[PDB]
Design a protein around this ligand. Structure first.
Ligand code: HEM
Ligand code: HEM
Ligand code: HEM
Ligand code: HEM
Ligand code: HEM
Ligand code: HEM
Ligand code: HEM
Ligand code: HEM
Ligand code: HEM
Ligand code: HEM
Ligand SMILES: *[C@@H]1O[C@H](CO[C@@H]2O[C@@H](C)[C@@H](O)[C@@H](O)[C@@H]2O)[C@@H](O)[C@H](O)[C@H]1NC(C)=O
Ligand SMILES: *[C@@H]1O[C@H](CO[C@@H]2O[C@@H](C)[C@@H](O)[C@@H](O)[C@@H]2O)[C@@H](O)[C@H](O)[C@H]1NC(C)=O
Lengths: 144, 149, 147, 146, 146, 146, 149, 144, 147, 146
């Protein structure tokens, strides 16, 4: 599927519901990263500085806050090609020296998708739109 | 007491949510750009601190992306006011991001604090400047721990 | 002192680990951890508790001291919404401390950092800001007049 | 008397009737309204804490210290060492006041009525009579509480 | 002692804890539950009214008779002639049962906890202690209650 | 005036006071009840849409088109190109009617009162005065709205 | 009927929860030790059944740990009164644990039943001896199936 | 992390909430053992006598009741070193002839931790305190 | 008979598997399982049902017998809270059984164990204690006077 | 008549109007209040079950057996073999009583009124008339129910 103008609009509104104002954000981020580390326990080592061993710590919850804020900026920029590419390049440099595999970006991608679906319900979740538009985001964080 | 109270925290999140746009940068970009316009017109030597993100060209894609980052970081902090444990960690991360930069001091944050105090009533309904600044200062206090005056 | 909503948070998180339905063994366990930590930040202050047998922190005398310290702290917490009474309660606690020779106000600063350090290990969703907004007025009101 | 079972029983019923927050002050105000109604002469003993006005922050502060004292002593009911040590500490504070021990009897009656009237019918009055004797004995030393 | 003013207080606090209708049955059950919890051995004294099962019609009839006796005695607290006539009558029913007068001490404790737990914090325990003595003295004749 | 912040502010408060569904028609009916009460002479200008009966489907249809016009114009407040293009389109429809521009002033007053009376105290009247000028200027071209 | 009814079950769990300490053995240990003190002072030859856990030394760590086990097993059974299917299985497990021990009979359980009837009103508020013993017997009935009289 | 006096207090209160009075205990135990056997299906064979094949049976629910009661006794004894060691040694003898691996004690450990978190919420769950104090318990059931 | 709360449990768990909205095929399926199990515990009793063609348990006559047995059991269950009427209902059922030659009270004991065995296979969260407290008074009241 | 669809329809509406627990007895009491009001002479036929007092446990027991009989027969509506077998069994019980078949007509009227008055407007009276004929025919054998 393709991340066209319509899919970007749907993803935008569905993200706003899942991400919310701030009250369910701690649970939202927890659900995502409990999934990431379950599917890929080996990924924990890259998060040594932010207590990847214990995602219940305030240290890691702040990291999950930053990750979600990064997704929020990209989703909000999905209708702004030029600015989105600039922000995606900034995220790319933030991960450049960390050796993040393409397999791991897909793991977090799936966790983000299970988390939004868990937050808004399988009844409305648009898997094709979300898969296509997160691909656009992750692929820009990997350079290409 | 001038302390950011639980009450003040609720009010700020209301002042912020009634202006924040959850889907489109149009409202975030406008607020942020307006804040730095105010900051630059009051602190002229500040523009050179953002040479890297084209501070002189407020409408560039580079500074648009920086404004979005600043507003995203403020949004995260305002939301984390409900969870001060995590908030304290996030404010430390922001502090080291503003550290090791000559010209970035505690005086610039007092200036941008006034910038927000002039921008926000123009876009926010039911704006409380007292309750806003008490918690805005609480936020900047963590962001300026190891900074010069 | 501190706002009603902040005071409500502090009081609730305090009853969680401290109330009338809690055996004294956990009372002095917390007290021993608190004071052992105070003697690690300010070793000079351990001499002030010689009258209650600080030499043996497992003694009945020192257990009783920590119990009445935490009881006084509990009393201040539960009167956060009665500012007039809290003023009198802290004034009395201040007199009970100013009269004690060797006590500096910095020792109460150190106690504050001990409380801010220990309590999160005990309390669910410890709110350090609501606790700071309320404990610091308490700390100063008890250390008011101390060197 | 006041065996280990009665000590636990007393700790249970105390925690319930004592409650949390501002109810604590209402309990304490009721306790002292009863003392001064049982023995009006006892009120003049507390001019140092402004018993002239039981609503004053001075007497409210006194109420808090006293009921806080009851709570910590009851909490140590299961540890003799800490209990007696704190009771000795209370004795050293009350002895220089030269108090008629008959007022500690009055205090007990007012405490039983307040706790039982707050806790309900299942109030164990014999256990509270026995275990208060242990408290008043430690503070006064009078064998009236034997 | 139990003076006229204390008699008025007890009559007033009894009337209120006692209540109307099935509240009296519930009041009575609590008093006797407290008695048998305060002194489990006293329960065997009441095999004549089937104390083995407290919800049995035989024992509920006994409860009703007892709290009915309390009510009528308390009501006559202000007439010495009628009151002593009834206490004498109650003594004649209890004496040939060879009861240990200490059980009447236990009974009083349960009565205080029941009335007080029902009436609330302003229960006058000294008043009830002194006036129940008058009842227990009238029934047992034991100068224990003097 | 009417900077970008005031344009966002106006868009916010408009969306709230305008609402969804049938409340939209109630807002619109109130807006036009005010216009005809502010200037009774203006009613005769709308006989082509049966202003003789504001409850008629003809005038209700006119109300809907007008407030729908306000909504789309306010929605384009942040894009000058689309905004002016639509304002030119509205001007080409209103010019052949030879309307006294003083009635667009009346329309603005009625709009402020309706939105503010629906939105509440936090209504930003200066921002609505500034940004309505931009709208009336685009439709009329009169420098009365400068 | 003398049957442990749904009503009696609710009441017993209330009498038990209002005494049970969910975090500290201080209340459990006291009740248990007091029960066996009562049992030993009424059944002298019973102490020798607990030679293994130092029955003669009620304050030893060995008998403290045994008391906690007994009270834990009673607590599990009282809670399982709400689910008699599972309860029946658990009471069978307890039965075989009290089986193959000479001196452990149906007469000792009647004795400890009285022990509880004297201990419990001293520590429990609002104690109902009728409703308590009807369900306590229901519990011991499963614990003494294949035991001697 | 270390299972010190403060962590023992926190674990005590968090366990009391999760274990509760008795109403949610059947669901509590089920959640734990559905996790154990999912992560390690091979462990089922050691529970032949208590119907490890079918954890819905009254036979296994009674076994889960005993396990939780064993944990309750240990948690309640975490502030009583001497008595705790005695009870832990009793649990050790109850497992001595069963060949329980150190890997399996960690599986049940993780299930117990996911069950308490599921019962009290990720928002309050103290992973470091629970990991450290269950280590103390399991290590005592394994002799050392 | 049995308490109201126990009776409420029994009645609810019974309507779950037996009510007016249930086709008779499941009615005699349960009946066939119940009686087949009774003939396995007490084979001597199968001769007593010769009048309703127990030889063929798929016959219309025996299906009807089991249906009216379960209907009578249903009738007793649904009158657990009307003790006076249940007494009359069970007295009538007793007369309908005492008159039958060859019936021992032990056969009703065996039927009770069959019910306690079969019903958990059919009923969600079957409560054997609430069922024992209620069925055993029913069983005895129907077997009252039986040899 | 009384085809398979009407048999299912009757089973549906019966289950609903018959209900669970004590409502069953209320339905049955209403059914028999109607029978005795439709035909007061029929009451004397039930002196063996104390129809003299419809609140007696004797007549309540009779009501239960009858409506239980209706329920089991209606439940077997879809199986001819079991149905006729049970109807023959009911016939062997009713024949020795020498009952006027006109009372089974009365029973039907009272049953229709009770079910329909409980089930509501969607009561299918023709289906109940047809399928009750099948029941009364099996019990009486009278061709009045043909
Ligand atoms: C797919 C969308 C992703 C987003 C939106 C995102 C966002 C972020 C952000 C905003 C930061 C903060 C950087 C800083 O402030 O220094 C960060 C840090 C980090 N991210 Fe990501 N990230 C993504 C994917 C990933 C993946 C898939 C991995 C590894 C599997 C990863 C590993 C890391 C690491 C190791 C850090 C450094 C944390 C530290 O030690 O401070 N990221 N991420
Ligand atoms: C509430 C107030 C502020 C917030 C929330 C904030 C937040 C942020 C954030 C999130 C970034 C992005 C860092 C990164 O992506 O690595 C950033 C960058 C930066 N900020 Fe701030 N900031 C605030 C005030 C200020 C002030 C007052 C100054 C100077 C006087 C300043 C100077 C800078 C600079 C120099 C950079 C880095 C330039 C670049 O990334 O290209 N900030 N800020
Ligand atoms: C929240 C903090 C504190 C509270 C609420 C508190 C309260 C109390 C109370 C109620 C007493 C016993 C008064 C009595 O005898 O009736 C006490 C004793 C004492 N406190 Fe404080 N205290 C606190 C912190 C400190 C600190 C930081 C120090 C520094 C050394 C200190 C030094 C002492 C000493 C020396 C005693 C006397 C011990 C003795 O009886 O020999 N306290 N405190
Ligand atoms: C169980 C009974 C009692 C307890 C637990 C108790 C406890 C206390 C406590 C904690 C204080 C405060 C000490 C301080 O911080 O300075 C106090 C003070 C005092 N108590 Fe007691 N008390 C009891 C009974 C009584 C009685 C019966 C009397 C007199 C009839 C009495 C007379 C006083 C007086 C006069 C003061 C000091 C008033 C002042 O500071 O001006 N107490 N008591
Ligand atoms: C303290 C106030 C008491 C009152 C007002 C009271 C009243 C009564 C009354 C009215 C009766 C019924 C007499 C009759 O009609 O035969 C009665 C019977 C009895 N009372 Fe008391 N009683 C009191 C205390 C006690 C106590 C403390 C005990 C023993 C512990 C006791 C033992 C008995 C016994 C054994 C009976 C006979 C029960 C029977 O008829 O089988 N009474 N009492
Ligand atoms: C911001 C202010 C206004 C807006 C957005 C607005 C918008 C509109 C719209 C959308 C139509 C329908 C065009 C069509 O589909 O044919 C319309 C028609 C019309 N407007 Fe305006 N209008 C405004 C103010 C006014 C005022 C102040 C007057 C006169 C005092 C006026 C007079 C008319 C008339 C006479 C018509 C046509 C009536 C008819 O169709 O018979 N408008 N306007
Ligand atoms: C409600 C009453 C009782 C309960 C809940 C109970 C429960 C228990 C439990 C849970 C154990 C632990 C078994 C193990 O860990 O393997 C135990 C052990 C034992 N019980 Fe009981 N019990 C009760 C009454 C009795 C009585 C009345 C007797 C003797 C008259 C008795 C004799 C024993 C013995 C001899 C042991 C084993 C000694 C040992 O493990 O070191 N129990 N009981
Ligand atoms: C980690 C904490 C554990 C606790 C608190 C615990 C507790 C218990 C208890 C109390 C029993 C009852 C023993 C009896 O009554 O005879 C038991 C039995 C048993 N446990 Fe554990 N256990 C734990 C770990 C494990 C693990 C990790 C395994 C295997 C992976 C295991 C396997 C068994 C087996 C096979 C039985 C025997 C059940 C039977 O056949 O009756 N246990 N456990
Ligand atoms: C809950 C248990 C039982 C109930 C409610 C019950 C009830 C009934 C009912 C209602 C009938 C038909 C009465 C009629 O003709 O109108 C019946 C028939 C009969 N029952 Fe019972 N019954 C039960 C158990 C048993 C048992 C255990 C036996 C032992 C053999 C038994 C033997 C019979 C026999 C022999 C008949 C007569 C069959 C025939 O019509 O030829 N029933 N029972
Ligand atoms: C569909 C209609 C009817 C059904 C299903 C029905 C069913 C029953 C049943 C189940 C019994 C109990 C048999 C027993 O256990 O002994 C019974 C008894 C009886 N029925 Fe019917 N019945 C119906 C109509 C009638 C009518 C219309 C009459 C008379 C007008 C009648 C007269 C009687 C009498 C007199 C008894 C026995 C009374 C006694 O035991 O003393 N029935 N019926
Ligand atoms: C310190 O105290 C420990 C606890 O013992 C209790 O307190 C002491 C003061 C005595 O009163 C004793 O009777 C109490 O049981 C002792 O176990 C420990 O040995 C003491 N330490 C030293 C160095 O004496
Ligand atoms: C037993 O009955 C089975 C069911 O058939 C039905 O019942 C019998 C009694 C007849 O009435 C028949 O018309 C019914 O359809 C038979 O399928 C089966 O063959 C029978 N078994 C024997 C041995 O006859």
């Amino acid at each position: 599927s393709e991340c066209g103008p319509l899919q970007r609009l749907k993803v935008k509104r569905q993200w706003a519901e899942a991400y919310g104002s701030g009250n369910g954000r701690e649970e939202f981020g927890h659900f995502i990263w409990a999934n990431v580390f379950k599917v890929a326990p080996s990924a924990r080592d890259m998060f040594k500085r932010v207590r990847g061993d214990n995602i219940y710590t305030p240290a890691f919850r702040a990291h999950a806050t930053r990750v979600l804020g990064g997704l929020d900026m990209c989703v909000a920029l999905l209708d702004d090609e030029s600015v989105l590419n600039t922000q995606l390049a900034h995220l790319a440099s933030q991960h450049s020296s960390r050796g993040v595999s393409a397999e791991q970006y897909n793991v977090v991608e799936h966790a983000v998708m299970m988390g939004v679906e868990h937050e808004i319900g399988q009844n409305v979740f648009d898997k094709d739109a979300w898969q296509a538009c997160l691909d656009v985001i992750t692929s820009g964080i990997q350079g290409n | 007491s001038n302390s950011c109270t639980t009450e003040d925290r609720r009010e700020m999140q209301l002042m912020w949510a009634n202006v924040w746009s959850a889907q489109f940068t149009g409202r975030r970009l406008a607020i942020a750009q307006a804040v730095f316009k105010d900051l630059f017109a009051h602190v002229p030597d500040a523009v050179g601190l953002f040479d890297r993100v084209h501070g002189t060209e407020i409408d560039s894609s580079e500074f648009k992306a920086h404004c979005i980052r600043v507003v995203n970081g403020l949004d995260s902090a305002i939301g984390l006011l409900s969870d001060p444990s995590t908030l304290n960690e996030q404010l430390s991360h922001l502090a080291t991001q503003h550290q090791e930069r000559a010209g970035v001091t505690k005086g610039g944050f007092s200036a941008i604090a006034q910038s927000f105090l002039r921008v926000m009533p123009q876009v926010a309904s039911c704006f409380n400047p007292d309750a806003w600044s008490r918690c805005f200062n609480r936020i900047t206090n963590g962001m300026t721990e190891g900074l010069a005056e | 002192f501190c706002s009603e909503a902040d005071a409500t948070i502090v009081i609730k998180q305090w009853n969680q680990i401290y109330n009338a339905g809690i055996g004294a063994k956990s009372r002095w366990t917390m007290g021993n951890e608190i004071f052992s930590s105070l003697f690690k930040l300010k070793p000079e202050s351990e001499v002030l508790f010689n009258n209650v047998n600080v030499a043996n922190m497992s003694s009945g005398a020192f257990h009783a001291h920590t119990v009445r310290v935490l009881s006084g702290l509990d009393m201040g917490i539960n009167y956060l919404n009665d500012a007039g009474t809290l003023t009198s309660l802290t004034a009395h606690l201040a007199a009970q401390h100013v009269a004690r020779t060797g006590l500096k106000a910095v020792y109460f600063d150190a106690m504050g950092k001990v409380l801010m350090t220990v309590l999160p290990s005990l309390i669910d969703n410890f709110n350090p800001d609501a606790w700071r907004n309320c404990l610091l007025p308490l700390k100063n009101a008890i250390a008011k007049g101390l060197p | 008397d006041c065996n280990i079972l009665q000590r636990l029983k007393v700790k249970m019923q105390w925690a319930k009737a004592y409650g949390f927050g501002t109810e604590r002050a209402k309990f304490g105000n009721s306790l002292w309204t009863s003392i001064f109604n049982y023995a009006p002469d006892a009120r003049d003993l507390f001019k140092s804490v402004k018993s002239e006005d039981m609503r004053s922050p001075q007497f409210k502060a006194h109420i808090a210290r006293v009921i806080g004292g009851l709570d910590r002593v009851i909490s140590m009911f299961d540890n003799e060492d800490a209990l007696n040590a704190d009771l000795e500490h209370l004795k050293s504070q009350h002895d220089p006041r030269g108090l008629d021990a008959l007022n500690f009897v009055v205090f007990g009656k007012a405490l039983f009525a307040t706790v039982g009237g707050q806790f309900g019918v299942c109030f164990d009055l014999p256990a509270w009579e026995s275990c208060y004797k242990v408290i008043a004995m430690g503070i006064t030393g009078n064998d009236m509480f034997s």
